[PDB]
């Protein structure tokens, strides 16, 4: 119960400062103040254009490696077992498979950025 009280206290502390930052001071709002900032000059096109990304392969393998380390976090509890040799072998084999995947990406120029 205490965690929801703490989260609510933090949230209404955060939203109190924003609400007093929008109604307190004097406003002079024109159709020049809110223009997008492009270092002093008018922008040449929209900001919603496709902003192409070069590190797509690293993002996909970030998903796969995040799941690899998600599988790996039960290790402090798994060290409290009786079948210690099998647990040690499977932990070592999982980490070795992670390293094998990383090395195969490294040797195949997958981590190098496109263009």
């Amino acid at each position: 119960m205490n965690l929801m009280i703490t989260l609510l206290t933090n949230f209404t502390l955060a939203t109190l400062l924003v609400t007093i930052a929008f109604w307190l001071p004097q406003l002079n709002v024109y159709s020049e103040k809110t223009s997008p900032y492009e270092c002093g000059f008018d922008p040449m096109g929209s900001a919603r254009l496709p902003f192409s990304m070069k590190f797509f392969l690293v993002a996909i393998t970030f998903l796969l490696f995040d799941l690899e380390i998600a599988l790996l976090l039960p290790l402090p509890w798994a060290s409290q077992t009786t079948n210690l040799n099998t647990m040690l072998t499977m932990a070592l084999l999982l980490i070795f498979l992670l390293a094998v995947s990383l090395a195969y990406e490294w040797t195949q120029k997958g981590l190098e950025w496109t263009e």
Binding site: L27, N28, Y30, E32, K33, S35, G40
Partner: protein, 156 residues
Amino acid sequence: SRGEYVVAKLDDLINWARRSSLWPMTFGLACCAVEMMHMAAPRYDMDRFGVVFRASPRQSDVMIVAGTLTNKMAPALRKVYDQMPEPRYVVSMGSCANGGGYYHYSYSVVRGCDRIVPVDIYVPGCPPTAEALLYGILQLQKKIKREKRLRIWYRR
């Protein structure tokens, strides 16, 4: 009575908090920009007075026009001034931004930046020294101290 006392105290508080937290934007054009960053050198060190650069116009308070304002630069200067939130202040540096200076009769030089933006402090020189620019900044601070905005609101 009491309301005038309260609004005078509130005016003093907000004037101190505004004059002790001047954030100028990184904006220079010419020789006078080199003199401004020589004012920001460790010899004079305007960071002592709470004066620290902020590159974006949205997070700046005072605009320092240091350099020559040409015809190709005037719409950019005006736009950057417009994007600066209220309250905003303008300090003119050097003879180029004051009245054109050496290039007053030039075909492509705006004769003074006061034709584009409302200027508070004019700092003369070519270039004005770093002590002169610090004097202009302190003059702008003393000008901010003499503002009676809530007093005017209460009287109106």
